[PDB]
């Protein structure tokens, strides 16, 4: 968020549940942190990516976006290490993931190579 006057570098941790595919984004609070202690940015829910092209004739002021109107859900496919991914207009570049995630991705999902990428400046 450097471009705005309120530049920040707060790190985030993103959880995806295999219960039903749900994503939550918790923040990493610092020592001083300048900020009120808050639990999470977003809560367990289903993110659409693109919805059915009949969205023009959908009264979004009355009915919510539902499984009839979406044609595709956020899945682990956008959730791959090394590549940025947008949620609600947030750039959210993935820095790294856990060893259990690396295992599961390599032996159950299929892609074997997800090397880490440093994101920290040299002071």
């Amino acid at each position: 968020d450097t471009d705005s006057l309120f530049g920040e570098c707060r790190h985030y941790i993103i959880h995806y549940y295999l219960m039903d595919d749900t994503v939550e984004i918790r923040e990493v609070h610092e020592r001083n942190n300048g900020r009120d202690p808050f639990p999470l940015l977003m809560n367990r829910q289903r993110m659409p990516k693109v919805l059915v092209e009949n969205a023009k004739n959908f009264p979004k002021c009355v009915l919510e976006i539902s499984d009839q109107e979406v044609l595709e859900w956020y899945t682990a496919k956008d959730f791959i290490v090394g590549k940025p991914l947008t949620i609600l207009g947030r750039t959210f570049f993935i820095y790294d993931c856990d060893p259990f995630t690396r295992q599961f991705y390599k032996d159950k999902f299929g892609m074997p190579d997800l090397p880490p990428v440093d994101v920290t400046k040299k002071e």
Binding site: T2, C9, V117, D118, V119, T120, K121
Partner: peptide
């Protein structure tokens, strides 16, 4: 292609 790693 190039947007660095940024802090």
């Amino acid at each position: 292609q190039t947007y660095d790693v940024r802090a």
